[PDB]
Amino acid sequence: AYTNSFTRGVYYPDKVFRSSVLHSTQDLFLPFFSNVTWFHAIHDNPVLPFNDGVYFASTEKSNIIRGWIFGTTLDSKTQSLLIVNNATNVVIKVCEFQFCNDPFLGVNCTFEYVSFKNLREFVFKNIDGYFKIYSKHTPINLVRDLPQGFSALEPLVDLPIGINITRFQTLLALHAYYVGYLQPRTFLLKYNENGTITDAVDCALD
Amino acid sequence: PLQSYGFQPTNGVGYQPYRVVVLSFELLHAPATVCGPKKSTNLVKNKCVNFNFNGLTGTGVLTESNKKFLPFQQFGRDIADTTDAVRDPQTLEILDIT
Ligand SMILES: *[C@@H]1O[C@H](CO)[C@@H](O)[C@H](O)[C@H]1NC(C)=O
Ligand SMILES: *[C@@H]1O[C@H](CO)[C@@H](O)[C@H](O)[C@H]1NC(C)=O
Ligand SMILES: *[C@@H]1O[C@H](CO)[C@@H](O)[C@H](O)[C@H]1NC(C)=O
Ligand SMILES: *[C@@H]1O[C@H](CO)[C@@H](O)[C@H](O)[C@H]1NC(C)=O
């Protein structure tokens, strides 16, 4: 399936801020007005590609998803990073684990770290060995589509790991998400009087 | 081969148990590891002065400000890489660079 990635793949280009400008740059980005693939939360865990960082979102308020499954070959012979939602701390472990056709939790270690009306909109990217956490928790009103609107993304945490680009599985629990990829496009942004992104334009769109 | 330590200090100084550490340092590809707390000096206002911040640096006068930030900024420039605004990394208080 596919839906329309209208505008919302946009983040602050670095830990770094101007005010009231129209500044241009380039990085890996979700391109504007492109297709973005839509999937289900049935009962599954399908196979999806991962192309140099993704724009990820899902409409939820009740902790359906639990995190992301990383690892270069994902069968306990790999340097596997893990993201676990706890409802207390988003914890990160870099170890070896055992994975199945449905590895989740429901109803050689080298690195450790401890920290519907809503959209938890996350972007992971891995430039030069640096794994970065770009986020936005925004409230919305409807459920079936990404709205015609605008959003910005903010940084949380840098982490030096350097492992994954090809593919993955993901986490669920027993009791719908958006996924769209990045590519190098030169842009033009806008900082407001506050220095938040309020509108931007992809150069290579039309 | 596993005959054990003879730590019976009735001998001289040559046979004494010592609280030893071995600092083993090598290099991999990920920087910004354990480093040193570089002494965290004071501030000054209303006089032109050299300054070095956490990576970026310059020279000028440091005064108050009306512009506002968010939880993430460490930098500030009005237009065309003319750096003018730093919220300080200790008091978390916004300043201008005239
Ligand atoms: C995805 O993009 C292609 C390229 O234009 C288009 O043909 C296709 O219809 C799009 N997908 C959907 C579901 O519209
Ligand atoms: C991981 O631990 C296992 C122990 O079962 C060991 O055989 C292996 O050499 C270790 N390293 C890797 C890279 O798998
Ligand atoms: C959150 O942190 C760890 C990881 O699960 C666990 O020990 C702790 O009990 C968790 N808190 C909960 C489940 O309330
Ligand atoms: C930006 O700053 C102005 C200061 O006059 C304020 O009125 C406005 O609400 C601020 N915007 C945000 C999103 O904080």
* Shortest-distance atom of ligand 3 to CA A91: 4
How far apart (Å, rounded) are the C-alpha atoms in residues B36 and B46? Answer: 30
> Measured from the CA of A1, which atom of ligand 1 is nearest?
13
User: Could you say which of B30, B74, B78 has the minimum Cβ distance to residue A19?
Assistant: B78
Residue A105 token pair: 């939790």
How many Å lie between the alpha carbon of A65 and the closest alpha carbon of chain B? 27
Task: Reduce the DSSP state of residue A61 to 3 states and report it.
Answer: coil
Q: Which residues of A9-33 are buried (b: 16+ CB within 10 A; e: fewer)?
A: bbbbbeeebbbebebeeebbbbbbe
CA atoms of A140 and B11, how far apart (whole Å) = 78
Q: Which residue type does A147 have?
A: P
- Residue A71: name the closest of A95, A91, A47, A48 by CA: A95
Chain A residues near residue B72 by CB distance under 8 angstroms = 12, 15, 17, 154-155
DSSP string, chain B: --PPP-----S-GGG-------------S----S-----------SS-EEEE-SS-EEEE-EE-------TT----BSSSS-B-EEE-TTT--EEEE-
Residue to substitute in A78, A95, A108 for testing ligand 2 pocket (most ligand atoms within 8 angstroms of CB): A108
d(CA B76, CA A44): 47
Q: How far is B88 from chain A (nearest CA, A)?
A: 14
What residues contact A138, with CB distance under 8 A and at least 6 apart? Answer: A118, A119, A121, A151
Nearest CA to ligand 3 atom 13: A86
Gyration radius of chain B over CA positions:
25
- Chosen from A11, A12, A15, A17 to mutate, greatest number of chain B CBs within 10 A: A17
Q: What is the resolution of the experimental data for this entry, in Å?
A: 4.5
Which residue of chain A has the CA closest to B69?
Answer: A194
What is the 8-class DSSP label of residue A148? S
Helix-strand-coil percent breakdown of chain A, rounded to 5? 0, 40, 60
Q: Which atom of ligand 1 is nearest to the CA of A2?
A: 13
Torsion sign, CA atoms A56, A48, A5, A11: positive
Residue B40's contacts (CB-CB under 8 Å, 6 or more residues apart) are: B90
Task: Count the residues in chain B.
Answer: 98
Helix (H, G, I), strand (E, B) or coil at A185: strand
Contact A154 B75 (CB under 8 A): no
| Binary contact (B73, A160; C-beta < 8 A) | no
- CA A172 to centroid of chain Cα atoms: 16
Q: How far apart are CA A181 and CA A29, in angstroms?
A: 7
Query: A78 CA distance to ligand 2 centroid (A)?
Result: 9
Measured distance CA(B26)–CA(B17) in Å, rounded: 28
Q: What angle do CA A182, A188, A194 make, to 5 degrees?
A: 105
Q: Are strands A3-5 and A177-181 parallel, antiparallel or unpaired?
A: unpaired
For chains A and B, CB pairs below 8 A equal 40
**Obtained via which technique?**
cryo-EM
Distance CA A36, CA A176 (A): 13
CB-CB contact of A170 with A68 (8 Å):
yes
Can you tell me which residue has the tokens 């030069």?
A128
